[PDB]
Amino acid sequence: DLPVLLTDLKIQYTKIFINNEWHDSVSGKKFPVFNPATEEELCQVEEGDKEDVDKAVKAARQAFQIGSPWRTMDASERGRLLYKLADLIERDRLLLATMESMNGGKLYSNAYLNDLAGCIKTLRYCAGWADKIQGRTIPIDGNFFTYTRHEPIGVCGQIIPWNFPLVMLIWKIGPALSCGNTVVVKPAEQTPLTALHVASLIKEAGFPPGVVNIVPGYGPTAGAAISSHMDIDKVAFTGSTEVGKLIKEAAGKSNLKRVTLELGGKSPCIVLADADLDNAVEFAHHGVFYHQGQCCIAASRIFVEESIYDEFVRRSVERAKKYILGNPLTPGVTQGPQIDKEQYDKILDLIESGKKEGAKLECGGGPWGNKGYFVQPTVFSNVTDEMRIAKEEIFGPVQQIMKFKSLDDVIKRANNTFYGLSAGVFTKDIDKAITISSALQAGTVWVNCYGVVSAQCPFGGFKMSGNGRELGEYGFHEYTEVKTVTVKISQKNS
Amino acid sequence: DLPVLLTDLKIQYTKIFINNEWHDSVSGKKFPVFNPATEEELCQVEEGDKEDVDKAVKAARQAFQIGSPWRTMDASERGRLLYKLADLIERDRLLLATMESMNGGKLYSNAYLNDLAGCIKTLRYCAGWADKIQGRTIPIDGNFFTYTRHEPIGVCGQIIPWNFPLVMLIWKIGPALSCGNTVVVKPAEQTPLTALHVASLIKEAGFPPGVVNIVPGYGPTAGAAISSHMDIDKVAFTGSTEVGKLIKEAAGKSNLKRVTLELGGKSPCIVLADADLDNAVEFAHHGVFYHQGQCCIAASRIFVEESIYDEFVRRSVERAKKYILGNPLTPGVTQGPQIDKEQYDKILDLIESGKKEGAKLECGGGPWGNKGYFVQPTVFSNVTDEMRIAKEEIFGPVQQIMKFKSLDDVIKRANNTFYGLSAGVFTKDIDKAITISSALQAGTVWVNCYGVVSAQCPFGGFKMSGNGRELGEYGFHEYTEVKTVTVKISQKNS
Amino acid sequence: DLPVLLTDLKIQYTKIFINNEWHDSVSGKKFPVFNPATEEELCQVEEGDKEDVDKAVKAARQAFQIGSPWRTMDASERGRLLYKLADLIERDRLLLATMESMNGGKLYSNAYLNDLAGCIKTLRYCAGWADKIQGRTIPIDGNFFTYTRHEPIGVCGQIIPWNFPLVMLIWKIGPALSCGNTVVVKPAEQTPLTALHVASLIKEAGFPPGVVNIVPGYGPTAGAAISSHMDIDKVAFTGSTEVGKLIKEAAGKSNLKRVTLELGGKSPCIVLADADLDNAVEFAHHGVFYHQGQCCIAASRIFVEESIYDEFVRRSVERAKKYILGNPLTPGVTQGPQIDKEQYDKILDLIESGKKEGAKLECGGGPWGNKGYFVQPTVFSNVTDEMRIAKEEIFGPVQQIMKFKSLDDVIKRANNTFYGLSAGVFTKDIDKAITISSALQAGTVWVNCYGVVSAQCPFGGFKMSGNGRELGEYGFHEYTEVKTVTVKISQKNS
Amino acid sequence: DLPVLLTDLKIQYTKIFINNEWHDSVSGKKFPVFNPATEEELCQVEEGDKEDVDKAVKAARQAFQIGSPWRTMDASERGRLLYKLADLIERDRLLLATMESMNGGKLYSNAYLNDLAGCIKTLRYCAGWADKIQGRTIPIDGNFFTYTRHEPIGVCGQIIPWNFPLVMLIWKIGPALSCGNTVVVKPAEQTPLTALHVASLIKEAGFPPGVVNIVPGYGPTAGAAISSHMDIDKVAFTGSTEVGKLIKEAAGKSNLKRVTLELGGKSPCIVLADADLDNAVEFAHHGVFYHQGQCCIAASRIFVEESIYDEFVRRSVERAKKYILGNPLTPGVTQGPQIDKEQYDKILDLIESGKKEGAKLECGGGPWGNKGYFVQPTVFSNVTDEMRIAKEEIFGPVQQIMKFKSLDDVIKRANNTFYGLSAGVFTKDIDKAITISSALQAGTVWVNCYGVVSAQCPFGGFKMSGNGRELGEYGFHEYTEVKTVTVKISQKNS
Ligand SMILES: NC(=O)c1ccc[n+]([C@@H]2O[C@H](COP(=O)([O-])OP(=O)(O)OC[C@H]3O[C@@H](n4cnc5c(N)ncnc54)[C@H](O)[C@@H]3O)[C@@H](O)[C@H]2O)c1
Ligand SMILES: Cc1nc2ccccc2c2oc(C(=O)N3CCCCC3)cc12
Ligand SMILES: [Cl-]
Ligand SMILES: [Cl-]
Ligand SMILES: [Cl-]
Ligand SMILES: [Cl-]
Ligand SMILES: [Yb+3]
Ligand SMILES: [Yb+3]
């Protein structure tokens, strides 16, 4: 069942968080924060800029110094702190899910049952790794004793998008903190509020000051200050391809800091004639429409074998026509608004390109309502590979359905993109499932499902959908720096 | 193609191998070695007993001493020696395959193309791990530096069966030597000859003396001397369930040495109605008949869904009726003899139990020829779970075919055995393949194939088919002894 | 600080725990449980025997069936249950530490601050591994897809000693449960009480019924029923060498179940002339006297370089003369009783052998008090390697101090034992610390400390001190069974 | 001993290597290649540019296609090919060492005994990993089967410097090929010759065409074509900080290809008063002077405790005054030339800055000879942290020696650099060795030695000395791309 907050949500935490204390901006400037379902201002937040990032980095650098509490405490106690933070987020789950929905335009049902549960589970997963991060002893040639330390990197700047503010906050700080790093987090200008509430819980849990610093503010200002900072050792980012390129360039020009990126995609589904048809239609539908299409792994190209193409298209339209748009906090509402004017304009412009370029509009195709950034759920059939809605990430509720008959050809078409975040394969054939998934150039391939993401699985893109992996055992590698120590000895023995 | 030796095979190495020198038995006694296809003596071999094992253990213990060449050389040089040994076996492949066939009653085609290639590949695989065996550095609670050494165990006694003399020799010494152990090997009394030739190549490759010692001789004498020896750290064994129990008991009574066992099985195949029928028939046929049925992973219970049962039975009989029995060295011969009188008697007695207990004899069912331990390839249909040929490992060319209709029931029937070495599943359904293989209590489960064994895969039994794993990354664990070293330090840092 | 229970301890849980319900013994028989400090009966407990073990195994087998709640729940939820159990033990820490002290004769200060903290930390460590136990995907030769499952083994019988009842209970059930096994636990007849209280918390935490079963009772009865049971897949044991041999023999005779043993030791310390002398004296003192000497890793042979031998002996005697014997619940008491009459008699008989065989009695040497199994802390100097107190594990407060001058010789003397659980090295020289620790045949080697044991470190013996490892990453291997699944595919790609 | 080539070296391979065939440049242009010891031209080589890189990438992309020989062959056969290549380089060791010395200005003794042995050993190490690169099976939440493939990335562009042409060629292609990638290699314009000879051996070994392509040519032309290429998946680079920044920027602007860099350093040694003084002087001397100082790990800041500073300085000068300069092919010659005019000018300009800024010139300080880019081995004492020779990587035979008395302060001074490739610690104190090495921000820390690099150890920089690691188990991660495959199943079991 779906419990709700029984009193009005009151916003309390609006300031910059550095050394576990609340700071005004150095400039004194604040910026507004809006509800995307009403277009109304929720509150003002301190606007961080380069001078505020500079204060946060100095705090994170001090907290990382040899001999500091965060460097010297047991790894198991790092894990304890993360498990306590997860307990506190669970305590404030109603508050946090409500704030996430109100600020992010996110269905409250999903915010409470999915985002908040993913936050809690991911933190608990990360807490468990803290004292299980291990180096090696190595049988080097010669009379030496050689071991490795998988040390924390140091100060990690982490730039977060607006589509999953809480989940992405925990995906970033969970592994970084578990490995022993300190962090300077820059939440999306649209959605700083839940991150600042989590900062209050980081204080309450007892993390040493400066281990986690949060600087709300804008991208070209605070974000660029992070990417180009001379004392940040690593930057992690999730968001647009364009900013990703900006970050890697600024990183190259400044101090060659380590960079990992996750940059969205144009993820394809291949539905073979032998697929469980109803299962494939349902998973591909949710794959493209989840969170109003504002998901990096959106299943935005669905290739269906000709023998079943028309049935797939009809059943997808039937399912797309069943949505209730409105305020994401009202029960029964099944689609909320897009985040803001920029994304809203982008979706409408791409929908129009689909009409003009000759796609078949099966349903939707325009805006909705008198307030809020709402877009009708839209289905396009007979899409071809050269159309804009086939090539560009839309980040809206816009589904593309294509036909194929040659399996060889559709794999090339699925791979013919600079993106490569995820893919789906729907078939009952063992051999096809293994060989197709091996052939797709995508970081996660789902077979007979879609959008299944768990803390135990590494997640990240092939090609221009990004570099590096998050979560799972493998993701923790990107938050460590390996040191080899080689000691001369009189005689070694195996 | 299949090259052959162009001169008569001459036997040269017949003595006990200790400290890289050839020893007569302490007793002076020798024992005969026979060709199972002719029942004629090939040569005499020095008979090792407890006093000879005692000399070999003293040599292996000396070679393992701290400061010795084998303990102090680079791990990478241990690997070099193993790769050189593989090169030398490849050089003597014609000789070794011929000797293996003549002594072991093994088809020369298989001996040359399969056993010898598996020997060479497994050695090269093991050589690659030598300098990649690594311990850990561990973020222990408190102000300590903790690391682990994955040391060699020490002197490993290794008792080998007669069905795959060379392959089992390399499966044992490859990992043991790669990890840095020293070994005392006791080949089967039936088949000492190829092991002694390999000992000549261990000398030629340059292994330090005492690293590999080979003591030919009998089970209750030399083998029991190994299992009960007070200075052997580990015993590894492949052979009968009965001896396996004898070894573990003697190990418990003496010095609590580590024991790993592989003890054969009664491995089942489940063939669902949707299986590729011809593929399933061919793999199950070879699965049961390979090397005259003298294989631990023999597919000796084949459960076939009723809808296709009669077709499966007919096609299996058709395939079983196509064999040519004779001397395993003559080209075109496709089935050789059983190893000796004991195995021959055991197979005939079990075949007769099948007739008496009411199985349907589809073909074969008796002995063959005027010399050699030959048994007609035999197929039984309508087998039921209480018959002796359903319960006891036969180790002969005797195939059992059963029907089922309830998938739930046939999994229980497949699991209703104290054995658990391997199983096969034949289906085109993705879900069935994953769920059935997860549900079978067997160490290796093949899907739409059978008998696929490679150096990269751990191999071993569930339940009374044995303990521990051989080969793959996981197998190397059983040839190391973990030491934790914990050092007090003034202050640790992550 | 050291909080205490503010009301009398009342014993509640005295029955057999099977399927999360409390059972009387099948026989109806109960046995008494005593306080070793007073020799007074505390309560009666249901006496489990073979028929009760048979009920527990049937319950554990049912809970392990494919499709059961414990097999199908998320690994992460297995970890959740373990973290909840740790929370509950932390809640009942005062109760549990008091009961442990009263039943086990264990100083309350240590019981509360060390045993209970080790229980809580080890459980939390084990909970973190549950969803991080992973198999492999393997690049096998040929056109196949090969992966491994690291499955739970199944029903694990776990026999626990009386010296660390709670800690050993958690060391056994923590890893077993984290890996997904079900367990049948047989606590020491002397000390069943804390295990039965933990069983009440296993119920409260919500573990599915039959996942943990606890059968109090005696060794030759309930314990032998476990070792010889035909449907227990693995037995783990900590206790005497003699029973260890009995278990491995019964395991070999019955169903070849997997066995791991930890069997105590005769652990040596080597103190070089350059050692921090006061540091070495203090660590070696606690190493031998901890928990009245009833510790497997007791530092029961201390070899000290001649130049500093007399100073080491004097300082050790000074420290040994500072103890206060009495009831382990009274504050300020620094040594409690031995567990029972058998251990008490054994210690006194070995002390007398030391006197007769010519050791120098520096202090102690006899019993103490009018009630309770108390032994004066005893120090022997000028011990030689042939004396009984040099060879046999004493398990009492009896310290042996020896001199050496040849480092080569003292390493041989340190290694000249069938035991091999642990060792200590005290030196300021880098090279000596690495080379000596590499040369000692012991499972844990401490450098400039002793007795440092943490959940992150594998723990176990070389030689006759046992087989296998507990805790750390490596310990989890012994609670999994590896299954290789190899799937035929049309074409593989790297 | 040191064998030599008995006939004149004849240069044969001067063309671009693509698809295992020799190509002229698309332009027709060639460039000269010089001997740095004589300043004389050795031969002309085809000059590759963007059009040639484009041909090589197309070939490498074709060789990486699903279904190709390199994608479908057994991993073990990838390893076979690498071991065969190592055999062939060993066969041509005299030829290759001579060519390396003549083209690279590298002492023949080192070229034959060190570079060529490192090439052979590193290849054999890499060959062993090929079929031991494994993914995971993961106990994900929900009813799913999840596994990972550690796939090759794809086409890897690899830009090589002139100081270790062969060793760096093998460090790049060894791991890349072992993991299954295809490569486009751009050797230094100064030193293309040995790489082209190795290309002839790649053909001879039987690597499929297009797996290894080598495009000799210049940095701003062929190198920039690689860094900015839209179909190269990863670029690896070793060389200057400045080019490293250029590569990462071009990578960010083009296709966000993965980048790893190794960029030299300013590596410090800390010599405590208790150090073995002669051992520290010898290791620090070779650490700074190896290969005429043209080593990334040059020990270019040596901090010595005041009590022993003057003795360290004298002994270092004594050792530096014992060199024989001349042609690196003549026996007895112990220092060769610098690579070219640019490096030569840079060294002399930095030597002069040392004089002007007030360092104490102990020996050397100017050029040498009438031909060749020779520099006298130069020692500076009383260096301070603000001088250019303290801050800038010199890449010449120029040693800096500094004093300290505060250990806290000297660690800060050691860390006060944007570099971070390596460091050395010289002390006999266990605690100091562990705590100092933990505190240094450097990728490899040697204790009581220096410059010990082996194929089993990961190697790479902290901070602006680069990102990622090469060699060892950890280095192989950077040549794989992780794919998560998650399959819906009816019910999972642990
Ligand atoms: N890490 C090392 O081992 C190493 C090696 C060589 C030089 N260095 C440092 O660099 C300094 C300058 O030496 P250098 O000029 O010969 O080094 P460099 O970085 O310019 O040359 C190294 C490699 O990079 C190539 N390259 C040059 N410009 C390029 C560009 N725009 N794009 C892509 N590739 C390009 C070169 O052709 C060569 O293959 C040296 O003095 C030394 O301090 C370090
Ligand atoms: C034997 C040897 N001794 C050395 C002593 C002092 C300094 C450097 C040394 C060295 O470098 C190498 C070497 O091949 N490198 C390439 C890889 C990066 C490191 C340099 C070998 C080698
Ligand atoms: Cl992985
Ligand atoms: Cl495995
Ligand atoms: Cl370990
Ligand atoms: Cl590592
Ligand atoms: Yb369906
Ligand atoms: Yb010296």
Author numbering:
A (entry chain A), B (entry chain A), C (entry chain A), D (entry chain A): 8 to 501
Show the paper's wording.
ALDH1A1 is a member of the ALDH family and is highly expressed by stem cells in ovarian and other cancers. Ovarian cancer cells with increased ALDH1A1 expression have a higher self-renewal ability, and HGSOC patients with tumors expressing high ALDH1A1 have poor overall survival. Although ALDH1A1 is a well-accepted marker for OCSC, the exact mechanism by which ALDH1A1 regulates stemness remains incompletely understood. In this study, we demonstrate that aldehyde dehydrogenase 1A1 (ALDH1A1) is essential for the survival of OCSCs.
To study the functional role of ALDH1A1 in OCSC, we identified a specific small-molecule inhibitor, compound 974 (hereafter referred to as 974). This inhibitor acts as a unique tool to selectively block ALDH1A1 activity over other ALDH isoforms. We demonstrated that 974 inhibited stemness phenotypes in ovarian cancer cell lines expressing ALDH1A1, and an in vivo limiting dilution analysis demonstrated an essential role for ALDH1A1 in CSC survival.
